[PDB]
């Protein structure tokens, strides 16, 4: 019987140290060679992975985008969808700018 | 044939389409055709708030509320495909669209109980055996309704769920423990459950309108109090193409 | 003095070349960034879309690289996405499309060049000053 | 030649006691009311000096609340002034959160003594009470304290003798120029003109 | 039910009742009624008169 706060306790999952596929902001795709802009907008739409390499499985990637996914496959992370963070659509706009 | 100019000011795009009495003619449904949904619109009217009811366990009440926020309660522009699944029934499974406005009533007494009026991620089904939407036609299904409030927000006094000063803050050293209700911010997720009966028809239009009776919950507020139950009453319209 | 010669000197190619610089070139940078357009770009952020800044490392791992003096300029040239997917030419300032963004239409290699150094050239003084907004101000 | 612990058990009560931000005369307020006491609460005893610890086992830091501020953010800084740890308010950008740089706590001496903490919260918590000073344990509920600080004796009486001196000084203006001016006191001498 | 007046050591309320204001401007009543609240005359009225 003792509640606590889900993004403080998830940041202790390994979502804090990579990038979650899942729930992380799209912002954090930028922080990789090529990958912000679409592959984001694919990789942030596309359903919720279950593994962390289902990403590569992603219906009409690129012959060169199925690529990169590979190449950068060693920062992404999964964890339980979390409801606080995704929903309000805020994985497109945390409300976080510069 | 009205323009924004023309409509602006009465109030009335929150009040939404209707059908006159030339409906009762059945649309006709293929079960060959892959049918979707435009606009599927719920203009209310009726907001009933399960009264907390005291300690004695007799039949627990649906007073009525008196509605505060002007007019910002309707809610359309809802499109999802229209699935024609075996036994003939139609279930629509809704995609996106405006469907959660925020509306907050003022209860009995001085209580201002707000809930989220909302028919999200609503996947609705009717009745087997139905080539034809008509006066008989209905629909029942789920929701998923989230919390007043987003991830972030801070109550005043700067707590907040996914930011926020994170404790009792202005007391510093207050007795922590019995704050935890307000200091850790839970975030709600629960169950919806409309129903939609079909009242006006047209057959060549697509278009169909009816009452409606949603049976939701408020405001979790982050965990302050348990929510209070709501149901939700008016008619919608809501316009059907191949 | 402060405003050194290799301070002022900065990356030129993908390849390491370096051009240094004149505090003429210089000053037209500044004269330029600011006529060039710092109406949205003010300081070192991005207003109409602060995910995107200036600093050296995220021009780096742009695509292509976009450190290079040389980098900025096919930008400033033709815009492409941090995708370097699809060209953002009708969204953003450019010699490409100069129909759109007048202030684009005067500016010349010349003056490019200079509006060039003056990106890679700011930070390396400013520090962080540079990419964060507000909170470091 | 002596345990850690050895080492602060050794340290005395009272003492540590004075290390506590929560003695220090200027925090309180203008109209808190009462005796110390009604705001941190009743000190019962001392819990152990709370020394941080890192996941990667470097010693860190509470960088302590300076008189100046009722309110205040913890920051646990490596031994060197470099931030290792703080309790984030964005969170969604946390790049030194606790939990996702794995802070914890053990405590030597005090009641708490030899025990070590690991729990994000806890650890957490025990580090923003540490920004006080020395932790400790306070009974509120004899006196029903209210969770803010008041200032000591010593406080109020400067404040006394504050206004009370800084007033006089005008009776002395007062008087001095009434004492001198008992003859003009009346009115101004119906006789105008010269000068 | 449980906390009529009365109890709560209401005094002068308690009129309000025999003359006939039941409710107040809030939309309840001493019954327990609902929808239905009184015209100037409730509660309120009875006092801001
Ligand atoms: C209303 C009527 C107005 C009439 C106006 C008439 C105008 C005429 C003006 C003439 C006088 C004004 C100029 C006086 C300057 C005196 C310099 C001074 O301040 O001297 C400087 C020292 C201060 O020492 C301080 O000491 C502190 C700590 O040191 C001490 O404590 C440390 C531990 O923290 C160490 O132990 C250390 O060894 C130990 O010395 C810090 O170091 C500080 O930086 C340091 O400033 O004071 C001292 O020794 C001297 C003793 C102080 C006497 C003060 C007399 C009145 C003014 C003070 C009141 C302040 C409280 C007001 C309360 C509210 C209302 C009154
Ligand atoms: C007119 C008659 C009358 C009656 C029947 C009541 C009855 C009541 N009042 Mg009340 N009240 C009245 C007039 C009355 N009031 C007036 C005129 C005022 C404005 C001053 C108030 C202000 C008031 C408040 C703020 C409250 C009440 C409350 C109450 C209820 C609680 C009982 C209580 O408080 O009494 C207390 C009983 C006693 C104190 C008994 C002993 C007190 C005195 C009479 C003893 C000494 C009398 C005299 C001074 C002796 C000296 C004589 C001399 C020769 C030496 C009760 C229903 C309470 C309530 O229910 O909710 C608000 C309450 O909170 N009243
Ligand atoms: C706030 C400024 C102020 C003003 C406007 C007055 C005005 C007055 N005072 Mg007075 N007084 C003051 C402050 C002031 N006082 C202070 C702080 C004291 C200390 C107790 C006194 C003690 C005092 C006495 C005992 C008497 C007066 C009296 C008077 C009245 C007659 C004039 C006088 O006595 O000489 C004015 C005196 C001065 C202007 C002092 C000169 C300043 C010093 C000597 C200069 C040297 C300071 C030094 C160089 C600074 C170096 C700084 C260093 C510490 C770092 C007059 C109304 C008389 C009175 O009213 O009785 C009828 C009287 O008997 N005063
Ligand atoms: C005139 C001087 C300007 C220069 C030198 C400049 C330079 C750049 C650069 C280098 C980028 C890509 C950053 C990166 O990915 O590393 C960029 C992006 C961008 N710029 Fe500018 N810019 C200028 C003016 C403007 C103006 C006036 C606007 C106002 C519309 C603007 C709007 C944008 C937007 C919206 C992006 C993000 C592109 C996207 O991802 O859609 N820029 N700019």
């Keep these: 019987e003792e509640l606590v706060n889900v993004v403080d306790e998830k940041l202790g999952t390994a979502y804090g140290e990579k990038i979650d596929l899942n729930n992380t902001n799209i912002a954090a795709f930028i922080q990789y060679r090529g990958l912000y802009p679409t592959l984001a907008k694919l990789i942030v739409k596309n359903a919720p992975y279950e593994s962390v390499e289902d990403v590569l499985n992603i219906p009409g990637l690129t012959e060169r985008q199925k690529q990169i996914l590979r190449e950068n496959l060693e920062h992404f992370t999964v964890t339980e969808v979390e409801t606080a963070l995704v929903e309000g659509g805020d994985r497109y706009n945390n409300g976080l700018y510069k | 044939t009205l323009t924004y100019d023309d409509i602006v000011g009465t109030g009335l795009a929150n009040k939404c389409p209707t059908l006159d009495d030339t409906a009762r003619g059945a649309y006709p449904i293929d079960s060959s055709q892959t049918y979707r949904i435009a606009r599927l619109c719920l203009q209310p009217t009726t907001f009933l708030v399960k009264e907390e009811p005291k300690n004695k366990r007799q ?10 926020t002007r007019e910002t309660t309707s809610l359309d522009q809802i499109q999802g495909e229209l699935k024609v699944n075996s036994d003939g029934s139609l279930t629509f499974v809704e995609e996106d669209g405006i469907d959660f406005q925020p509306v907050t009533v003022q209860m009995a007494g001085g209580e201002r109980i707000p809930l989220l009026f909302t028919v999200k991620n609503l996947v609705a089904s009717t009745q087997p055996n139905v080539t034809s939407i008509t006066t008989s036609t209905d629909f ?59 009242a006006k028809v047209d057959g060549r239009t697509g278009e169909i309108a009816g009452t409606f009776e949603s049976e939701q919950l408020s405001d979790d507020d ?15 319209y809501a316009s059907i193409e191949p | 003095a402060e405003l050194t010669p290799e301070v002022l000197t900065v990356p030129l190619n993908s390849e390491g070349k370096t051009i240094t610089l004149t505090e003429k070139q210089y000053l037209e940078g500044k004269r330029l960034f600011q006529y060039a357009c710092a109406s949205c770009h003010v300081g070192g952020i991005t207003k109409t879309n602060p995910s995107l800044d200036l600093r050296t490392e995220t021009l780096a791992l742009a695509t292509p690289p976009r450190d290079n003096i ?68 | 030649g002596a345990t850690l612990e050895e080492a602060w058990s050794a340290i005395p009560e009272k003492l540590a006691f004075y290390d506590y931000i929560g003695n220090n005369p200027a925090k309180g307020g203008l109209f ?40 205040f953010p913890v920051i646990l800084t490596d031994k060197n002034g470099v931030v290792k740890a703080d309790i984030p308010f964005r969170r969604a950008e946390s790049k030194y959160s606790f939990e996702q740089q794995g802070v914890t706590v053990s ?35 004899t006196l029903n304290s209210d969770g803010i600080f008041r200032t000591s004796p010593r406080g109020w009486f400067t404040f006394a003798h504050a206004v009370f001196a800084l007033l006089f000084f005008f009776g002395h203006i007062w008087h001095g120029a009434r004492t001198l001016f008992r003859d003009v006191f009346s009115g101004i001498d119906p006789e105008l003109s010269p000068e | 039910v449980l906390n009529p007046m009365w109890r709560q050591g209401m005094f002068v309320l308690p009129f309000m009742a025999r003359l006939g204001v039941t409710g107040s401007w809030s939309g309840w009543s001493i019954t327990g009624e609902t929808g239905i609240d009184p015209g100037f005359w409730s509660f309120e009225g009875v006092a801001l008169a």
């Design chain 4, 32 to 71: 808190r009311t009462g005796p110390m006491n009604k705001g941190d609460g009743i000190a019962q005893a001392w819990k152990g000096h709370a020394v941080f610890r890192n996941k990667e086992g470097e010693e860190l830091f509470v960088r302590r609340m300076p008189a100046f501020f009722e309110s």
């Design chain 2, 59 to 68: 039949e627990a009440e649906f007073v009525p509320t008196k509605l505060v």
């Design chain 2, 140 to 198: 029942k299904g789920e929701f998923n309704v989230p919390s007043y409030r987003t991830a972030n927000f801070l109550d005043p006094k700067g707590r907040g769920l996914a930011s926020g000063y994170d404790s009792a803050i202005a007391l510093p050293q207050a007795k922590e423990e019995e704050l935890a209700r307000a200091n850790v911010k839970r975030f709600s997720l629960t169950k919806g459950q409309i129903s939609l009966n079909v």
């Design chain 4, 107 to 141: 405590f030597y001496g005090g009641e708490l003594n030899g025990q070590t903490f690991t729990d994000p919260p806890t650890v957490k918590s025990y580090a923003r009470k540490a920004i006080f000073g020395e932790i400790f344990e306070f009974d509120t509920e």
């Design chain 3, 70 to 137: 040389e980098g900025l300029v096919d930008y400033m040239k033709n815009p492409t996405t941090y995708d370097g997917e699809q060209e953002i030419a009708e969204v953003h300032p450019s010699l490409r499309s100069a129909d759109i963004f007048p202030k684009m239409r005067n500016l010349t290699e010349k003056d490019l060049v200079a509006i060039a150094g003056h990106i890679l050239v700011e930070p390396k003084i400013l520090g962080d000053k540079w990419g964060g907004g507000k909170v470091y101000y």
């Design chain 2, 222 to 236: 982050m965990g302050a109090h348990e929510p209070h139950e709501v149901k939700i009453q008016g008619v919608f």
